[PDB]
Each structure stands twice: as C-alpha cells, then as structure tokens.
Amino acid sequence: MIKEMIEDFISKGGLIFTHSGRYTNTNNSCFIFNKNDIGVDTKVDMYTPKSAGIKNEEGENLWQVLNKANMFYRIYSGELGEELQYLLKSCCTAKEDVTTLPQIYFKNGEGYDILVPIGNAHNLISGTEYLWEHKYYNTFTQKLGGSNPQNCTHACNKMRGGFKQFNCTPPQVEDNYNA
Amino acid sequence: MRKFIIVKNVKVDGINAKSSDITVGMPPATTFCGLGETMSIKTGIVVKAVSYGSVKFEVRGSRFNTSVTKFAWQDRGNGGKANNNSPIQPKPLADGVFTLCFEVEWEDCAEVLVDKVTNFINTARIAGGTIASFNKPFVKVAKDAEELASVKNAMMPCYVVVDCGVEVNIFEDAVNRKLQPMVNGYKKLEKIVDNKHMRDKFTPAYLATPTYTMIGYKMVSNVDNFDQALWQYGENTKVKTIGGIYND
Amino acid sequence: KLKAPAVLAYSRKINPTNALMFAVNWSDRDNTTAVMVGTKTVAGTQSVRGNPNDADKGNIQTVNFANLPHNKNTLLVKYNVKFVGDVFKAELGGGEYSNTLQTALENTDFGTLAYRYVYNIAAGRTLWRNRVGAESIETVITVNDQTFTFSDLLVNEFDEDVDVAEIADMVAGVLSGEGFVTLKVEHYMLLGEGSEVFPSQEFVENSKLSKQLFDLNGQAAMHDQKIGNAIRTIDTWYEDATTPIAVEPYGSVVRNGVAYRAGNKTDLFTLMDGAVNGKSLTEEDQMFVTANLIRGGVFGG
Amino acid sequence: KLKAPAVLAYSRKINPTNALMFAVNWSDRDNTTAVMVGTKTVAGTQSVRGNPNDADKGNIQTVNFANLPHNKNTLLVKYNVKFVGDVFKAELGGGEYSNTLQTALENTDFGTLAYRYVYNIAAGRTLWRNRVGAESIETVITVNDQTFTFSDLLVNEFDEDVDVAEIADMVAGVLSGEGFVTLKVEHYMLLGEGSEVFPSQEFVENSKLSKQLFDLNGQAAMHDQKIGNAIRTIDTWYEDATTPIAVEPYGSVVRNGVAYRAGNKTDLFTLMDGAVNGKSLTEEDQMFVTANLIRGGVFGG
C-alpha cells in the first residue's frame, strides 16, 4: 500500500540520481543530486546493488508506481504529514569523483573554461516513449553490458524494444552531375 | 573579410561519432569552436566567423548496431583475468570527407600564414579523427556585404547549415518538423569543488550539460541571404546567427 | 610520497590510415580497378562437437565475399602512415612526473625501434592472410619525394640489413623530437587469378548476414586498428617464444588466448618504482617500457 | 589427461576459384561467349500430396532461367584450384595438442589422397548435373606449363591410370610440407544446341523472384564450395555404401537425411582423441583424419 516499498528501498542500498556517467564507464561511482530538476514531469533513476528490488505476491512492477497517481507528491502537499519527505530525502547523499571522465576546453570571451559533458536519462525516456507510438523505424539500437548486461540496469533486461538514437547522417553529393 | 583561406576534400579517418550519450553522427559545432580558439591561441590571430561543410560521411556498420571496437586491458588491475575476453566498451566510429573556409586578417605577408596553418593542420585531430589527404588551401578576397555573394560562386558545390528556430520545446517539435538536433552550447549547473586530477590547478572547474538547437542542411542556391550561416558568440556561452529568424 | 598517478595520457605517435584495396595486372600497372563486395549464400551442415543428434539438419546462411575479377592477377594494398615526435610530452595529466621518468630514460636506442618498425612495414606483416599462396611480394615506398623499392622476405631469421638503414635512422631521429614524416605504402602482390581476398571484418548484432566486410563506398578496405597493431609487434625481449607478439602492458593476445607477461615480475608499472628505489636494470627493459609508451593511450587507475 | 583445447581452428588447404560458364562450338573453341541469366514467367497447377480440394486454382510465378544460345552447342566451365601445403598447424591456438597430434601423424600416405583428389578433378565429378545427357566430355588441365587432356570414364569406382600419376605425385610432394601448386581447368561439354544449364541458386527473403540464380556481373556461375564438396568426396572408408560421400565430421548428406560416422565408434573426434593419447590407428582411419584436416574448420568448445 504505502510503506512497504519505502522501507524496502531504505533498508537495502537504494539511491536516487538523474545524471550519471555509467553509460560511458561502468567503473565510476560518482552520484550527485541536483536541485533544478524537481518538477511534475521530470524523470529520475534509481540504483541498488544486485538490481534486485522486490516482487509483489499479487504481481506489480516498478514502472507503474511512478505514474499511477503520484502518491508521494500527493503526500508532499501536507495532507497526511511532513515527516516522510525528510525521511526519504535523508537517504540521498551525493559523492564526487572525476576519474575516467572526458575534459573539454571551451573559450568564453577572454579566458578558458573546463567542462565535463554528461547525459540525461529523461531525454532518453521522453524520446523513446514519444517515438514508440508513431511507428518511426528511423533509428539505431544498442544494448549495454554485453555478456552480462542484466547486472547493470533494468533497461536492457525488461523492455526489449531498444533505445532510440537519432540518425544524424546528412545526404551525400552524387558525383558525375552538376548537383 | 579581407582574406579567406579555403581547404577542400579533407579526408578524416576514424571519427568518434559518440558525441554524447544520445547523439551519434555529425560532430557538434563545439569542437569547431574549440579548434578555432586553439588556432587563435597558437597562430595568434583573432577569428570571428566560422564556416564548414560536409561532402562525404559514412558510418561504419549497418542500419542499427553500427560498429563496436574491441578494447584490451590497459589498467593496472589485471594479471589473472587478463587472458581472455577483455571488456567491450561499445563505441562506434566513422569516416568522412569535409572542407573548411576561414577568415583571417594579416598584413605582414600573404603566404607565411599559409605555411603555418598547413603545418598546424598536418598535426591535428578531428574529433578523434586523423587527416588523410587534403587539397592545397587557396585564398579569396572580399570587401563588404553586397559583393559577398561572390564567395558563394567561388567554392561550390557543398551543403549549408541554416538555423530555423524552435517554437516552445523540441521534444515533439524535432519529430514533427523532421529536422535534426545539434548542440549549440553548454549550460553550467554547479561548480566542481575538487581540483586534484585536473590538467591545471588555476582554471576554474565547472559542470555543464548540453543544449540542443535546430539546424538544417540545404543547398547554397536555396539560401536567399547568406548571413543566416554565420556564427557569432553570444551571451551565456551561446552561439547565434547574424540574420536571426528565417523568413521567406 | 611519489604516489602513482591514476590519470596519465600520451598521444598516438603512429597514425595509420584506412588501407585501400585494388586489383591490377602484373604487367599493366598503369590501369587498375577497385574490388567490389557483393553478397552470396551458403548451405552447410552443423559441425558442433558433442552433438551427434543434430547432424541430420541443414543450414542456410548469407555472407559477403571478395576476390579478384575473372581476369586479374595482382592485389594492390595502399595506404599512408605518419610518424610524429613530441615524445615525453603529456597531453592529459602530469606536469612534474613525466620528467622524473625522463631523467631515467633517453638511454635507450631509438634506432632499433625504428629498424624494427620499418622492417615490419617492409616485410609485409601488415597483411595477415593475403600472403598465403603468393610467390612474389614487393613494395615501393615514397617518402620526402624519394622512392625505395623493397623485395624483402623471410620475416623469420632476423638479420641486419644495410639497405633499409637510412630510412630507419631518419625516422629514429624524427622520434627524438621533431615534426612529422609521412610514408606511402603501396604493397603489390601476385596471389593468383581469381583467388579469394581477405578484407577486415566487423561484428554487428545478429542481422540478415553472418559475415560482413568493411566497405568504403563500394570497395573493400582494412581497419586502422589492425594496421596499427601490425606496426607495433617488435617485442623480442623475453628469453623464449620466438615469432614475437604485439607490445602492450600486461602483454598477452586474446586471439589464441595466451597469457604472457603475467604477474611474474615482468610488467610495465612494476619496473620504474623498483628502479628508482634500488639499482637500475638491464638495457632490455628500458626498450620495452619506451615501446609501449610510444603508442598513445590513457594509463592509470 | 590431455583435454582438447578450448579453441582449435584449422584453415582449409584446397582453395578452388569461383567457376565461370561460357558457350563455344566443338571446333572453334578459341573464341568464347558468355551465358546470360535474364528472367521469365511460369504458370501451373497446384499438385501436392493428398490435397484434391485445392486443384482448382492456377498459380503464376516469375522464375530465372539460363540456357545456351541457338548457335552454340558446347559448354565451357572454367576455374582454378590451389593446393597449399604446410598442414598440421592450427591457425588459432594450439601449442601442445596440435603438436602431439602432428607427431602421431605424417606416417600415412599422401599419395592415395592426392591421387583420389586429382581423379575427382579429372573425372569431371566436379561438374554437377549438367553432365546428364552428355555425349562426350574432355578435361584440359594445365600445370607447370604442361597440358593434359582427358576423356575419362568411370566417375565412381576409382581405377588405376598413368596420366594422373605424376600430378598426384606432385600434389603429394607439395602436401607433405611445402609451398603451393596451382591448376587451371577448362571443362568442355557437348549438351547440344539450345540445351539448358544449371548454375547455383540463392535463398533470399520474400522478393518478386521465386528461383534466383548466381551470377557475376550477369554471368551464370557456381559457388566455390560446391566444387570444394565435389573435390573431397573420397570417403570410401566405412562399413558399406560404395559411391562414397564427402569428408566431414559426423559424415552427413542432407539430401538423403542419413548421417554416417555417428556415435558408432567411428568419428573424427573419437579417432583424434585416440591418436593424441593412446594406441595407433589403422591405415584407413589415419588417412581419413589427415584428409579431414586438409579441409579447414573449428574444433573445441
């Protein structure tokens, strides 16, 4: 109903994050939480060791709980109490590490700036969900992990549809003609 | 505007197509900006306008799951397991033939600049690529805006990249108008406190994320006015066009 | 104190290009043609160990092939390679640690490295399965507007050669701090008439085909990585196991699944720390530790 | 205990070219013309087993045909064969299993295998069912600038001949450790004026055509493994069934659905295990094993 998932997530080593470099290198363990991304229609991601989770005896899945009625936001308003929000947020501790990340130098008027580009999971989720309903077979696909990909994320495990990559190939100039 | 140097049919090999975690294909213009500022700091000339074109571009592989490179053991954590099936780390590559057209102002000579720019190009990289063969760069002269069309009659044929604008947000607009995204710049989010493993101990460390803009690949003759294809550095680490919104 | 850096990088000193493949006649070398790829079908049984029961089933498959035309007898493999200097200049990480290795190095003989690299290029080790069955293999190399014609053979029984010494000395001088030198490799071979040709493969998620060939606008070509691996096989610096292997830290090739240079006191990072803390070592190992440094890459962890 | 390695790959030794088909007369064999492919349509009833009900419809298809012109009455099938020696070394892996297997081997006779191979080449068995309804055939084979002409009968039931003896001796000599030898063949055929031919067929996905044909730039031809399967059909070395079959582990022919050399005490793998650690083999099995080694493949895993 309300608690059991919450205490199951807390007792086991669960963590919430939105930007991570694991899609580039699996060896990194840097996780940070950003303030700006809180919103009604922003997507998040979670990690637990062994990627076990729990299974309902009646039969339930992780995806459905996020988008049914938004119960945790419905309690966020303060109808039932304010204690549980702090209870949940207290487990979100961020770690910093830059090893095995690219460095890019960028020019800003007079001077330099060093940057480390990172990806967003919400972009992937939105793109896949919006393209999966229009029957647009104009993308590549790729699976992470490799030999043992089920221990990395549930994305390779459960939804076999595949990720969507934009085809940025421009047309070529046909030779032996004016154009 | 006084002097333009043009290099055509530049063969680049083994381009790293994984620009980001979601964008694979044409490299972003931020690498062009970085190479331009590197040329500015190395040669010593301030450059304002940047132009480039696409001639050939082939991605290694097929319609999906293009190419995978076998990576071997290069870390000091091996010795027992380092005898079979090194980790995979999927990263596709590509091949291409491009061209460049740059503006330069210099009045001490006319050919020493060609010498040094050729020397620098001979020892450069293109998004992980490698220059294979290139034509001899040639020089063009321009004076002001009305005669600018002359240059479009000087270096045909190629494609051009033009801005068209976005309405509210691109999540559905990109599919609706069936154009291609591209990373116009980076937006800073927080500051990296640690200064241990950086390549420098004085440059400030910031964390940023890409921002997406709309560009389109068309014919030069189909472009009514050329100023839509100029790139100028803007406020908040952005790049803008001189002509603004496209209109008929 | 003197903690080993977990981040260090070095530039790719040797840059090979995409090898391109052509069909040309032995005596009509003015006119050449490209080799296409095409696609065909095969139908063979299953030869799987320990499966007597499944020997009565067929199997239809589709693969790409490549070979000389009906009337041609010469294979032409041509490409360009570039050697650059700037050694011992870190490109990502390290400002006061590379010099500490430099004051130990510069006692090695770069001439030997250049001799071995040019010998590998000239002999033809860059072509793996193309040399099986060819009676005549020769090359012509044009560098700095001067040309040399090599008919080198006998990759075994290494002997000193004085005809190739000049280019080896030139490039060796180039490595110890200079600009760039470009070499054009134009291997000619006379494998036969209509015989098969072996261009580089690439693997894809299970698709309509089962053996895809590398194509560059309707023409077979070889990957850069394989040529680069051909360039850097000089490692003859252990007491046995002739027919040397490629050079890399923890040097062991997975292709045949051998494990050489294991944790038996012969590695890369195990050396300099014991050299600075204690006495120096033989001249053999400076050779190896600079060889794998010349190849670019990121080292650390 | 000497377990078989994880990977043991052998490269093939008999490489045939990709055959080609032309049309000539019986006296002007100097000039040749090609054989095109084209296309056409067919229509007919649906006659299958135990289906009287669906015999009311007429199915129309489009097929691909091939036949001689109306002014030629001779078929010219030409290709080349290459025998490459240096047997008994695995291409992938193998330092102790392969070496011990070799030391056990090279006690058999290469002359018998070479003789049977050259007889299969000369008898015309490499020419598949175009030979039905043939008046008279001849084979012209050229080696070392020496030509030999055959009008040989008895495709099966290997007899004794002197014309193939020296070629068999040469092949046996080059097969017991040597370089390579090349043969060029010019099979001539007298089907008749306007008769049809039979090149290979493709199995493609659901396209417009219903029976495709193999072609090189629009020219009927045969794959270079049907010829390979025709060359190495010498396996006369089991309990019965003269008119032998090819050489492969778990000796099988899919067109009949019967798999000889099953788990009945005779097999490549069991005999190899006996040879590598145990007693010796008989005359038949040793040469069967080395003949199977002549063909490439993968073993172990």
JSON list of C-alpha atoms in Angstrom, two decimals, chain C residues 25 67-74 135 190-196, chain D residues 15-18 78-82 182-184:
[
{"chain": "C", "resi": 25, "resn": "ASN", "atom": "CA", "xyz": [47.70, -6.56, -63.61]},
{"chain": "C", "resi": 67, "resn": "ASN", "atom": "CA", "xyz": [38.02, -11.71, -54.69]},
{"chain": "C", "resi": 68, "resn": "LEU", "atom": "CA", "xyz": [39.86, -10.67, -57.83]},
{"chain": "C", "resi": 69, "resn": "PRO", "atom": "CA", "xyz": [37.86, -10.26, -61.06]},
{"chain": "C", "resi": 70, "resn": "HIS", "atom": "CA", "xyz": [37.71, -13.02, -63.67]},
{"chain": "C", "resi": 71, "resn": "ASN", "atom": "CA", "xyz": [40.90, -11.77, -65.39]},
{"chain": "C", "resi": 72, "resn": "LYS", "atom": "CA", "xyz": [43.34, -10.10, -62.97]},
{"chain": "C", "resi": 73, "resn": "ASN", "atom": "CA", "xyz": [46.36, -11.39, -61.08]},
{"chain": "C", "resi": 74, "resn": "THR", "atom": "CA", "xyz": [47.75, -8.62, -58.83]},
{"chain": "C", "resi": 135, "resn": "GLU", "atom": "CA", "xyz": [55.10, -16.38, -54.80]},
{"chain": "C", "resi": 190, "resn": "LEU", "atom": "CA", "xyz": [50.63, -11.68, -57.15]},
{"chain": "C", "resi": 191, "resn": "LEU", "atom": "CA", "xyz": [48.45, -14.09, -55.17]},
{"chain": "C", "resi": 192, "resn": "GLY", "atom": "CA", "xyz": [46.85, -15.57, -58.28]},
{"chain": "C", "resi": 193, "resn": "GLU", "atom": "CA", "xyz": [43.97, -15.49, -60.76]},
{"chain": "C", "resi": 194, "resn": "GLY", "atom": "CA", "xyz": [40.51, -15.18, -59.24]},
{"chain": "C", "resi": 195, "resn": "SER", "atom": "CA", "xyz": [41.67, -16.17, -55.76]},
{"chain": "C", "resi": 196, "resn": "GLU", "atom": "CA", "xyz": [39.86, -15.04, -52.62]},
{"chain": "D", "resi": 15, "resn": "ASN", "atom": "CA", "xyz": [41.12, -23.45, -52.36]},
{"chain": "D", "resi": 16, "resn": "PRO", "atom": "CA", "xyz": [39.07, -23.52, -55.58]},
{"chain": "D", "resi": 17, "resn": "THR", "atom": "CA", "xyz": [38.39, -20.46, -57.68]},
{"chain": "D", "resi": 18, "resn": "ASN", "atom": "CA", "xyz": [34.87, -19.26, -58.47]},
{"chain": "D", "resi": 78, "resn": "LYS", "atom": "CA", "xyz": [36.47, -22.97, -66.21]},
{"chain": "D", "resi": 79, "resn": "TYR", "atom": "CA", "xyz": [38.15, -22.26, -62.87]},
{"chain": "D", "resi": 80, "resn": "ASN", "atom": "CA", "xyz": [41.41, -22.74, -60.97]},
{"chain": "D", "resi": 81, "resn": "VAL", "atom": "CA", "xyz": [42.44, -24.82, -57.95]},
{"chain": "D", "resi": 82, "resn": "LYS", "atom": "CA", "xyz": [45.20, -24.09, -55.43]},
{"chain": "D", "resi": 182, "resn": "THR", "atom": "CA", "xyz": [48.06, -24.20, -58.94]},
{"chain": "D", "resi": 183, "resn": "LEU", "atom": "CA", "xyz": [45.92, -25.91, -61.59]},
{"chain": "D", "resi": 184, "resn": "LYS", "atom": "CA", "xyz": [43.72, -24.42, -64.32]}
]
